[PDB]
Amino acid sequence: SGAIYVGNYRVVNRHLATHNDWANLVWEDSSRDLLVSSTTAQGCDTIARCDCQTGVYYCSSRRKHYPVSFSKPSLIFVEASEYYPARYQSHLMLAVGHSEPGDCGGILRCQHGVVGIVSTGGNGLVGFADVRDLLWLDE
Ligand SMILES: Cn1cc2c(CC(=O)N3CCC[C@H](C(N)=O)C3)cccc2n1
Ligand SMILES: [Zn+2]
């Protein structure tokens, strides 16, 4: 579980989006596993505008925050699931670390702010969906 709240937007994993999320849809991308919905109230998360490759992510399966070294956003192969068949997810960042399916939503953050959210995992590699390119989240 977990979202990013910035201004009048709510950023979630598209595979965990609610009915209300789709009823107030701003933008979605299957290939990225992202969905943005509009909010009545105002969020106050700072989205990082950077090219960092180190951060700290929240892992609900361990109730801990872990420091990781992660790859630059790219097209990584992700195996089939009940939400998507076998495909190449884009804007994906991998790091060596623990993750479980319920961990999707946990924020990854650097000194500059929010980098992305947990999206994939398995084999001791946790995958984060990048959001630093979505400049429209701030205007
Ligand atoms: C965070 N996390 C998800 C895990 C899974 C499942 C997984 O990766 N996915 C299922 C949900 C949709 C995801 C996507 N974006 O396509 C793929 C299995 C083991 C460990 C995990 N750690
Ligand atoms: Zn940064």
* Cα–ligand 1 centroid distance for 122 (angstroms): 7
112 is in an annotated binding site: yes
Q: Which residue among the candidates 33, 59, 91, 130 is catalytic per the annotation?
A: 33
Integer Cα distance of 127 and 115 in angstroms: 12
Resolution value (Å, 1 decimal): 2.2
DSSP lists the bridge partners of residue 38 as 9
| 32: Cα separation from own chain's centroid | 9
Contacts of 41 (CB under 8 A, 6+ apart): none
Integer Cα distance of 36 and 59 in angstroms: 22
Among protein residues, the one whose CA lies closest to atom 6 of ligand 1: 101
Q: Which residue among the candidates 21, 103, 104, 130 is catalytic per the annotation?
A: 104
Strands, E assignment, the chain: 4-13, 25-29, 34-44, 54-59, 64-69, 74-78, 87-96, 107-110, 113-120, 125-130
91 is in an annotated binding site: no
Q: Which ligand is the nearest neighbour of the Cα of 78?
A: 1
Helices (H), 1-139: 19-23
Q: What does the domain layout of the chain look like in residue ranges? A: 3-44, 45-139
Integer Cα distance of 102 and 77 in angstroms: 20
Is residue 59 annotated as a catalytic residue, yes or no? no
In what order do the strands lie in the sheet containing 87-96? Answer: 64-69, 54-59, 107-110, 113-120, 125-130, 87-96, 74-78
